[PDB]
Amino acid sequence: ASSSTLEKRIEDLEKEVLRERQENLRLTRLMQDKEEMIGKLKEEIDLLNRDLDDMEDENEQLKQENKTLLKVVGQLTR
Amino acid sequence: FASSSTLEKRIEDLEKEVLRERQENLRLTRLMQDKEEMIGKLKEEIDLLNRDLDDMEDENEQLKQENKTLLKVVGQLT
């Protein structure tokens, strides 16, 4: 094993380490992005479910009003 | 100047390092694929909830026009 070949092996491997560290940094940051996205989506789901609950309530209320008005008309017909 | 042995160990160490960092990036890659799947399902859920909210919107409008008609009927009778 000649010292020149060894020194070049070291040079190459060190380049490699730097490269893969860059790639890992990239992946880590991307990971944080995906995580943020998951958070926002989950929040959006919670909001949508609150909206859905609100709609269920407004509609049930309207159905009871209709039931009442229909009942009234029923009385004005008999 | 560095010993052929010294160089051999720097090489040893660097190779261990590369293998380590590669394992780590593999881990991150798989974790990433997970995050993307998760995001997919969440977005799909958002689609279903928005469809449901649309359905509730239509039903809401139908109940409101029905309500208005009934009010009108009550007005014409008494």
Ligand SMILES: [K+]
């Ligand atoms: K070598």
Ligand SMILES: [K+]
């Ligand atoms: K290499």
Ligand SMILES: [K+]
């Ligand atoms: K890390």
Ligand SMILES: [K+]
């Ligand atoms: K060295």
Ligand SMILES: [K+]
């Ligand atoms: K090292």
Ligand SMILES: [K+]
């Ligand atoms: K890669």
